[PDB]
From a paper:
Crystal structures of BtPL33HA and BcPL33HA reveal a two-domain structure. The C-terminal domain possesses an extended loop region between β-strands 5 and 6 (Leu455-Leu484: BtPL33HA, and Ile464-Leu493: BcPL33HA), forming an octahedral Zn2+ coordination site [supported by anomalous X-ray diffraction data], along with the loop region between α-helices 12 and 13 from the N-terminal domain. The two domains oppose each other in such a way that a deep, open-ended cleft is formed resembling an active site that would be compatible with an endo-processive mode of action of BtPL33HA and BcPL33HA. Analysis using the Consurf server, which maps residue conservation from a sequence alignment to the structure, demonstrated a high level of amino acid conservation within the cleft, consistent with it housing the active site residues. Analysis of the five enzymes via SEC-coupled light scattering and SAXS indicated that the three PL33_1 enzymes BtPL33HA, BcPL33HA, and BsPL33Heparosan are dimeric, while the PL33_2 enzymes ObPL33CS and ObPL33Gellan are monomeric. SAXS data indicate that the dimeric enzymes all bind as head-to-head homodimers, generating elongated envelopes. This is consistent with PISA analysis of the crystal structures of BtPL33HA and BcPL33HA which predicted a buried surface area of ~1,388 Å2 and 1,006 Å2, and a complex significance score of 0.207 and 0.290, respectively. For all five of the analyzed enzymes, AF2-generated models display a closed tunnel-like topography housing the +2 and +1 subsites. The phenol of Y470 moves within 5 to 6 Å of the +1 GlcA and N-acetyl of the −1 GlcNAc, while F475 moves within 5 Å of the +2 GlcNAc, forming the tunnel topography. This differs significantly from the wide-open cleft observed in the crystal structures of both BtPL33HA and BcPL33HA.
Numbering used by the authors: 26 to 642
Write the structure that this text describes.
């Protein structure tokens, strides 16, 4: 945590903010509903696909979300029973809105009215799992209280746009529709935001040890759209926009300055990506007077999604994250354009893989509309993903290294209480021509143990199944104070090392253990350099991999995967075995196939001090 307060410094004060604010929704960057020519020019060939999406919803049947659909969360923790009809309802509305903007003949208005009307009858827009933050802590929506969550924020931003575009059309049919929708938005977004200081995601009660995360910018971004679209009293608007700036500053203050996403690439789009959206929304709402887009840290927070991307759908997957990824190109484009990152824009074009971008349907109206606005520029942008020799994130302690023969090495220092922590201090992952060769297993299906204190009985979470030693046969231990020390990165030598001794418990009986990586033009060198207090058990050095693994030759492990070969050479003191790891969990088997392997290298004798050297070529 660092007291940057970038937003508050950029605006100066509420009073200065109030003068910057753009009233009467003149900041809106889309064409008027009645500007058919404008919508045609902007949509191009997307027009037709949006209209056919609306035709599907012409006969959409609104679903009651049952009381028992909420009660289930309490009974059993099941959430899909509630989420599935809720999302269907919400997506129907968003697609009817996009279809009506594209066609503009009033043919979707009746169902828009139905969706708005139904939406005002629903007790709550909040997800069943998030309703336990009511006073009473019940999962059943309590008509006497309001809460704001991820779900209700999106639902509010969508209905605010529905109001903005269509209130005049609704009024021709019956003024009560608009009138009530406006009153509902006031009751469910606008008032609770201002009147309740204690929502955890707002972080006005934050103290060291408490989390701030994606919720903060995500919730705030939605709140801000609602205020900019509905609040036509300048004093009330400035007060609310100022509070959102103070809240989001909490998130910007908490993040690491090197710009790495600790949640990882799978979460980037809703963490730094929703911050970006919040900042777009605030910029447009202040005629660009309030902007952080020239700030390097905001740029680096964006480029992380480029640097973690290895190729052909593989991403760096430290912690409990998927090895597969390849994010929202339209999003990545817009972030890149805003911060002047050519890297980000080229990469968005690269993710399209020679295909035309699409307007997303989904439940995020801001992103649907912004994809309509900027997709045409994305479609013309020249594609590339040029990955530098070294990327070094010194606070987060991620290091990505690359050579000209198509090798990508990811390594980390860090600590064993990271987001979605794995016990993996000093681990590496190696890819050759985008093919994973020494691998990090990543995310499995959630069970009762996952978020319990039996978590580290799950093999994917254990240093045992990462590319690490078991020192005196002991793995790393969970905890904030199990960390790398003496962390070094020398970009010019493609070098990283960390004293990983301090990520092991006392039972490891280790004084120091330096794990070091040196990527040459055609090889990787790994070294382990250690002093133990007692030589109790043979050290065991483990490598995770897949494909065909051949340990027949002593001193050498050949790995063949998808026509890529590497050879791992190890010292004579070790004996090699290869253990099969079957993958019943399809969340893993969909990624790696039905089985992967652990290469176990067990030192023939215990030693007090020693140096192991591994070469992969
Ligand atoms: Zn892992």
């Amino acid at each position: 945590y660092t007291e940057r307060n970038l937003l508050q410094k950029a605006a100066g004060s509420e009073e200065q903010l109030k003068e910057a604010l753009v009233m009467n929704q003149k900041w809106v960057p889309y064409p008027a509903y009645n500007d058919r020519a404008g919508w045609n020019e902007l949509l191009g060939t997307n027009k037709e696909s949006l209209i056919r999406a609306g035709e599907k919803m012409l006969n959409y049947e609104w679903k009651v979300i049952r009381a028992t659909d909420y009660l289930e969360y309490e009974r059993s923790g099941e959430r899909n029973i509630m989420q599935n009809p809720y999302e269907a309802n919400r997506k129907a509305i968003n697609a009817l809105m996009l279809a009506e903007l594209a066609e503009g003949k009033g043919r979707f208005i009746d169902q828009l009215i139905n969706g708005a009307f139904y939406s005002c009858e629903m007790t709550s827009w909040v997800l069943s799992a998030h309703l336990v933050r009511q006073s009473t802590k019940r999962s059943l929506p309590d008509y006497r209280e309001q809460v704001i969550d991820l779900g209700s924020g999106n639902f509010g931003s969508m209905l605010s746009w529905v109001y903005y575009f269509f209130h005049d059309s609704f009024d021709k049919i019956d003024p009560v529709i608009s009138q009530r929708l406006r009153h509902t938005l006031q009751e469910r977004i606008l008032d609770p935001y201002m009147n309740n200081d204690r929502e955890w995601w707002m972080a006005f009660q934050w103290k060291p040890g408490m989390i701030i995360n994606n919720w903060n910018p995500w919730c705030n971004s939605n709140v801000l759209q609602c205020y900019l679209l509905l609040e036509n009293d300048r004093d009330r608007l400035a007060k609310a926009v100022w509070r959102s700036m103070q809240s989001v500053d909490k998130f910007i203050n908490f993040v690491k300055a090197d710009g790495a996403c600790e949640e990882g690439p799978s979460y980037w789009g809703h963490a730094a990506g929703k911050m970006y959206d919040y900042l777009q929304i605030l910029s447009d709402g202040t005629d660009g007077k309030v902007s952080l887009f020239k700030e390097p840290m905001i740029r680096r927070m964006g480029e992380y999604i480029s640097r973690t991307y290895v190729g052909n759908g593989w991403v760096v997957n430290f912690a409990d994250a998927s090895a597969k990824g390849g994010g929202d190109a339209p999003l990545i484009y817009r972030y890149g354009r805003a911060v002047g990152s050519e890297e980000m824009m080229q990469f968005a074009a690269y993710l399209l893989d020679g295909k035309r971008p699409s307007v997303p349907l989904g439940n995020d109206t801001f992103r649907s509309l912004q994809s309509i606005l900027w997709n045409g520029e994305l479609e013309k942008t020249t594609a590339a993903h040029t990955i530098p020799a070294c990327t070094w994130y010194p606070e987060t302690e991620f290091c990505y290294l690359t050579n000209k023969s198509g090798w990508f090495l990811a390594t980390k220092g860090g600590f064993n209480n990271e987001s979605h922590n794995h016990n993996d201090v000093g681990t590496f992952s190696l890819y050759v021509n985008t093919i994973p060769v020494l691998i990090d297993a990543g995310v499995g299906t959630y069970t009762r143990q996952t978020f319990s204190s039996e978590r580290y009985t799950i093999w994917t979470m254990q240093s045992n199944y990462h590319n690490l030693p078991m020192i005196n046969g002991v793995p790393q231990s969970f905890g904030q104070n199990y960390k790398a020390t003496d962390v070094v990165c020398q970009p010019k030598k493609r070098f990283f090392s960390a004293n990983i001794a301090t990520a092991y418990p006392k039972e490891a009986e280790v004084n120091s253990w330096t794990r070091a990586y040196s990527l040459g033009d055609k090889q990787l060198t790994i070294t382990d350099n250690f002093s133990l207090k007692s030589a109790k058990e043979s050290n065991q050095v483990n490598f995770l991999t897949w494909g065909k693994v051949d340990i027949s030759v002593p001193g050498k492990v050949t790995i063949d995967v998808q026509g890529q070969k590497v050879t791992l050479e190890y010292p004579g003191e070790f004996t090699a075995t290869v253990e099969t790891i079957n993958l019943p969990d399809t969340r893993l088997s969909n990624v790696w196939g039905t089985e992967i392997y652990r290469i176990a290298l067990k030192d023939k004798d215990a030693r007090l001090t020693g140096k192991y050297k591994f070469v992969i070529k």
